[PDB]
Scaffold this motif. Structure first.
Motif, PDB file in Angstrom:
ATOM      1  N   UNK A 196       0.862  -1.119   0.069  1.00 19.62           N
ATOM      2  CA  UNK A 196      -0.031   0.076   0.126  1.00 19.62           C
ATOM      3  C   UNK A 196       0.714   0.999  -0.126  1.00 19.62           C
ATOM      4  N   UNK A 197       0.329   2.403  -0.137  1.00 20.29           N
ATOM      5  CA  UNK A 197       0.824   3.720  -0.026  1.00 20.29           C
ATOM      6  C   UNK A 197       0.832   3.926   1.456  1.00 20.29           C
ATOM      7  N   UNK A 198       1.605   3.313   2.279  1.00 20.47           N
ATOM      8  CA  UNK A 198       1.469   3.414   3.680  1.00 20.47           C
ATOM      9  C   UNK A 198       2.365   4.447   4.309  1.00 20.47           C
ATOM     10  N   UNK A 199       1.705   4.881   5.329  1.00 21.40           N
ATOM     11  CA  UNK A 199       1.994   6.196   5.875  1.00 21.40           C
ATOM     12  C   UNK A 199       1.925   5.974   7.503  1.00 21.40           C
ATOM     13  N   UNK A 200       2.587   7.131   8.156  1.00 20.24           N
ATOM     14  CA  UNK A 200       2.245   7.191   9.682  1.00 20.24           C
ATOM     15  C   UNK A 200       1.805   8.487  10.259  1.00 20.24           C
ATOM     16  N   UNK A 201       0.655   8.329  10.863  1.00 23.02           N
ATOM     17  CA  UNK A 201       0.041   9.440  11.596  1.00 23.02           C
ATOM     18  C   UNK A 201       0.408   9.631  13.029  1.00 23.02           C
ATOM     19  N   UNK A 202       0.970  10.525  13.540  1.00 16.73           N
ATOM     20  CA  UNK A 202       1.649  10.657  14.824  1.00 16.73           C
ATOM     21  C   UNK A 202       0.787  11.349  15.668  1.00 16.73           C
ATOM     22  N   UNK A 368       8.300   5.137  16.054  1.00 20.67           N
ATOM     23  CA  UNK A 368       7.534   4.281  17.178  1.00 20.67           C
ATOM     24  C   UNK A 368       6.092   4.191  17.050  1.00 20.67           C
ATOM     25  N   UNK A 369       5.530   5.041  16.129  1.00 21.39           N
ATOM     26  CA  UNK A 369       3.975   5.043  16.000  1.00 21.39           C
ATOM     27  C   UNK A 369       3.587   3.956  15.024  1.00 21.39           C
ATOM     28  N   UNK A 370       4.414   3.173  14.381  1.00 19.78           N
ATOM     29  CA  UNK A 370       4.003   2.273  13.506  1.00 19.78           C
ATOM     30  C   UNK A 370       3.493   0.927  13.870  1.00 19.78           C
ATOM     31  N   UNK A 371       2.961  -0.035  13.236  1.00 21.82           N
ATOM     32  CA  UNK A 371       2.525  -1.329  13.887  1.00 21.82           C
ATOM     33  C   UNK A 371       3.705  -2.125  14.231  1.00 21.82           C
TER      34      UNK A 371
END
Ligand SMILES: CN1C(=O)[C@@](c2ccsc2)(c2cccc(-c3cccnc3)c2)N=C1N
Length: 371
Positions: A196-202, A368-371
């Protein structure tokens, strides 16, 4: 040139944006859903009650069977078909033709939509989630390999804005960045992984108010940018807290949770819509710099989807956060695959009232916000 790609997308509210393409020789014209949330170029290739046209392999002198089937089940529905390759172009896209993989859908369940006016799907994400496996080169991979088109595209999704579903328009600029499509600065968030176009929301805020969650919750189990989802979809814990805060900001005036549950429309009539009582929502995405982030701020005009009647276009998710069209419609979004990042900028097609504007603003420092 990019001027000729402007306004090359259409669709109906809630039924996806599509771009005109041609497949085979002579060219067969099909409208194709632009979908950043999948990786197969798959097109109706047989009669279906919702299709008024479809890909006829036998009419294409340039078709080539791969003698291989593909079955794609998914939550809501499924599709299956037969793999091949053929020449493909995008008339209002780059002036090139490529030989691409094509899944000719022969059977399908709850896949096509009545009246949507598209006949197929252009999976623009990466090989990793391609079906039946990652050896089936996605279209964009083929385009970049076979031409000198730069490994980048950008989507300016505009929505409808002011009997039958509203029409939407937009632009898919392939191979670059059209400066007339946005104002202000482009901010980039890294693609965490190329599937996916995976991103991180903080962080997320409702009317300035932090939802104060462990940011892992925002990306549980992933957050993606997906033009082929209409809604902003949030993990359960986040959805609940979100709608809670939203119900509170608009306390003056009440709605049935049928509405909040995204299956029940509510109406005012002609321009009485009290946008002002609904709060803005800011998603802070991880910056290119470790401890930085930037926020994209979206207005009720984007998350109340017109059906003056609207449906609440935030809904719950068991597969992570999906930043779908209602989030993208504020912005010009750059899928910079070559630098592994997604940039966001305020869109020239600005659906804002005279008090608020969707915004892209940064930097904001998060220490640190990722799965
Ligand atoms: C979430 N998603 C899907 O379900 C879909 C997919 C792709 C391969 S199997 C499922 C898909 C299939 C058919 C229709 C639509 C759709 C409907 C309304 C609005 N916009 C998109 C999406 N593409 C995405 N990203």
């Amino acid at each position: 040139s990019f001027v000729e790609m402007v306004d090359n997308l259409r669709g109906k509210s809630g039924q996806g944006y599509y771009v005109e393409m041609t497949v085979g020789s002579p060219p067969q014209t099909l409208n194709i859903l632009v979908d950043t949330g999948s990786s197969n170029f798959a097109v109706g290739a047989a009669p279906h009650p919702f299709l008024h046209r479809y890909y006829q392999r036998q009419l294409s002198s340039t078709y080539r069977d791969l003698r291989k089937g593909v079955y794609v089940p998914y939550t809501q529905g499924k599709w299956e078909g037969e793999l091949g390759t053929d020449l493909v172009s995008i008339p209002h896209g780059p002036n090139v033709t490529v030989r691409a993989n094509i899944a000719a859908i022969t059977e399908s369940d709850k896949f096509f939509i009545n009246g949507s006016n598209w006949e197929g799907i252009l999976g623009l994400a990466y090989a990793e989630i391609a079906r039946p496996d990652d050896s089936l080169e996605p279209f964009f991979d083929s385009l970049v390999k076979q031409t000198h088109v730069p490994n980048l595209f950008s989507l300016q999704l505009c929505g409808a804005g002011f009997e039958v579903l509203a029409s939407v328009g937009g632009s898919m600029i392939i191979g670059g960045i059209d400066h007339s499509l946005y104002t202000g600065s482009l901010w980039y968030t890294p693609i965490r992984r190329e599937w996916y176009y995976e991103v991180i929301i903080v962080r997320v805020e409702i009317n300035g108010q932090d939802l104060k969650m462990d940011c892992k919750e925002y990306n549980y189990d992933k957050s993606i940018v997906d033009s082929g989802t209409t809604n902003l979809r949030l993990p359960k814990k986040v959805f609940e807290a979100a709608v809670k805060s939203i119900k509170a900001a608009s306390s003056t005036e009440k709605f049935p949770d049928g509405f909040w549950l995204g299956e029940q429309l509510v109406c005012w009539q002609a321009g009485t819509t009290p946008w002002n009582i609904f709060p803005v929502i800011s998603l802070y995405l991880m910056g290119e710099v470790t401890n930085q982030s930037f926020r994209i701020t979206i207005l009720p005009q984007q998350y109340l989807r017109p059906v003056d009647c609207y449906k609440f276009a935030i809904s719950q998710s068991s597969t992570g956060t999906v930043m779908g069209a209602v989030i993208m419609e504020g912005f010009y979004v750059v899928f910079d695959r070559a630098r592994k990042r997604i940039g966001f900028a305020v869109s020239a097609c600005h659906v804002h009232d005279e008090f608020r504007t969707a915004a892209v603003e940064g930097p904001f420092v998060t220490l640190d916000c990722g799965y």
